[PDB]
């Protein structure tokens, strides 16, 4: 498991960096967004 990726590099306003190389062997924000163990964070959390 080599932990690396182009995620650490800050990209402002649109990410034009090649997208196949974003996160390597690291959980994405999408991967934690579809996997959370809580449920239905309240409407006042907005």
Partner 1 sequence: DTMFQYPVYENELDTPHLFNITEPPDFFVYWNVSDFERTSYPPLPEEDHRLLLPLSGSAPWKQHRKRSLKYLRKHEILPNYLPHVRQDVNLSVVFPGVYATRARLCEETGEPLPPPPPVSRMTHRNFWMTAHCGNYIELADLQHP
Partner 2 sequence: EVKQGVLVERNMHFWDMIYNVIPELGLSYPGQRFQWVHSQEFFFLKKVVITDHNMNLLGVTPMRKMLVWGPFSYYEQRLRRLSALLHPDDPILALEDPHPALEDKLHITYSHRNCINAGFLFGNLMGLKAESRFGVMPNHHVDPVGAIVAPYAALTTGAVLVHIHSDMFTDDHA
Partner 3 sequence: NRSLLGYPLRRAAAMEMLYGGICIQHLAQPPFPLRKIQSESLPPPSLQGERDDLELEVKDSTGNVMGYRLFPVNIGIRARTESVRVRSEDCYKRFLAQK
Binding site for partner 3 (CB under 8 A): 11-14, 16, 18, 41, 44-46
Nearest residue to 21 via CA among 36, 32, 39, 8:
8
35: Cβ contacts below 8 Å, ≥ 6 apart: none
What does 26 bind: partner 3, partner 2, partner 1, none (CB cut-off 5 to 8 Å by kind)?
A: partner 2
Q: Check binding of 31 to partner 2 (CB under 8 A).
A: no
What does 20 bind: partner 2, partner 1, partner 3, none (CB cut-off 5 to 8 Å by kind)?
A: partner 1
């Amino acid at each position: 498991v080599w932990l690396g990726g182009t995620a650490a590099n800050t990209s402002l306003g649109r990410d034009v960096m090649p997208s196949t190389g974003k996160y390597i062997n690291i959980v994405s924000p999408t991967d934690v967004a579809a996997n959370i163990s809580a449920g239905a964070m309240p409407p006042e959390a907005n």
